[PDB]
Amino acid sequence: NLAPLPPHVPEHLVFDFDMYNPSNLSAGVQEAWAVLQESNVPDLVWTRCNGGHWIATRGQLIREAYEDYRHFSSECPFIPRYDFIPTSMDPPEQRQFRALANQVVGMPVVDKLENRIQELACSLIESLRPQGQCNFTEDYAEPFPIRIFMLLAGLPEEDIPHLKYLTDQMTRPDGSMTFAEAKEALYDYLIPIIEQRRQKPGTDAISIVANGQVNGRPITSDEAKRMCGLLLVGGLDTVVNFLSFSMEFLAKSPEHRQELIERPERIPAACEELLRRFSLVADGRILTSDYEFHGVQLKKGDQILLPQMLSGLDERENAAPMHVDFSRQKVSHTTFGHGSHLCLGQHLARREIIVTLKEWLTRIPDFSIAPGAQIQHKSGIVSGVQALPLVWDPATTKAV
C-alpha cells in the first residue's frame, strides 16, 4: 500500500497522491490532479503510493527538471520501476534517432497528409451521422489514429484488427498476452516489412526509418523495429483520449460549440486552449545522483513524477486555469512535453484534432451527452475517458 518513508525525506513534504486512482476522480481527472496545486501543498512533494516517489506540482519545476537531463534521466521514465526508442535514451545519443523520426512525422510530411486525414475523418463521421447517436470513444476516436498510422507507414487496411489488438494489449490487457508477448508479436509483424523495405524502399515511414543512418553507420533491425514500434504506440492512446476530453467539453457547453460554429477560423486557437485545459500525460524521470533542487534534498535513484498535465493548469502560468477561453492571448502549457524528448508527433496530433473538430462541427453541429449518462474518467500515465455516449437529432445534420 504505502511504501515505507526513506530516511532522507522530511515528513512535512508527504502527500499520498495515487496517480492510478486519485481520490477526486469522479469530479473529473484534471480536477483530481489539481488538488496538488492547493495553497497548502508544497511545490515538490513525496508520495508513498506506487513504490514511493517525488511529484513536482508547479509549471516552473516541471519545465526545469525536463531541461536538466543530466540530473533527471530518462533511463526509468515510468512509475513504478519496455525497450522503445528514443524513450529511454538521454542526450547525446538521442539526437540522431530523433532527427530520423522527425523525417517521417515532421511538418512537411503532415502538410502533405492533411487532406487524407480530412477524408478519413469525413467517412467516419458520415457513417455515424444518420444514426443519431454513438459512443464517440469507441466509434470515432479509436478507429481514427490507427488508420492514420497505416497511411503514414504504407500498411494495408486488412492488418488493422490484428495490429490494434496488439497495441490494445500493451495498454489494456485482456489477459491473452503479457506485455512482452504483445511487444514480440508486434516485432514479429514489423521485422519482415523492415527487411523487405531495406532492399526495395518507398516514401513511407517504415522505408525511411529502415534506410536511416546512426553513428555514420546503417540503422540496425533491432533499432528500426524499436523506433517503428514507438511511432505506432505514441500516437494511439493520447489522441483517442484527448479527442474524447474535447468532445465531452463541447457536448456539455453549447456556448463554446456555437463560438466555433460561428467563427471556424478560431478552431486552430481553440485546439491550443483545449490542449492546455484537457492535458493528459504524466511521465517521470530518475535521479542520476544526489541533488538539491529548490531546497529539497533528492537522492540518487529516486524517481520523480513530472506531470506534463499540470503546467497548463497552474494558476501561476494561466489565470483562471479551469476556465476554457478560446481568446486567451498567451496559452501556456507543456502538453506535448518539454526539453529533449518533446513530442515528435505534435504536428500530426494538432492536425488530427483540428480536422476532427472542423469536420464534426460542419456535419453534426448540435450534439449532447446521452440523457442520464455519466462520464467516467481514468487516471495514469495517459489519463482518459472510459466512454462517451453522444446523441443528436439527425434532421439538424448535413451530408457533404
Ligand code: HEM
Ligand atoms: C494529443 C496527442 C499527444 C500528446 C498529448 C503527446 C504527448 C507526448 C509527450 C508528453 C511526450 C514526451 C514524454 C517525455 O518527455 O518523456 C511525447 C513524446 C513522443 N511522442 Fe507524443 N503525444 C501525442 C501524440 C503523438 C503522436 C500522434 C505521435 C505520432 C507517432 C507521437 C509520437 C511520439 C514519439 C515518437 C515521442 C518520443 C520523443 C522522444 O523521446 O524523442 N506522439 N508525446
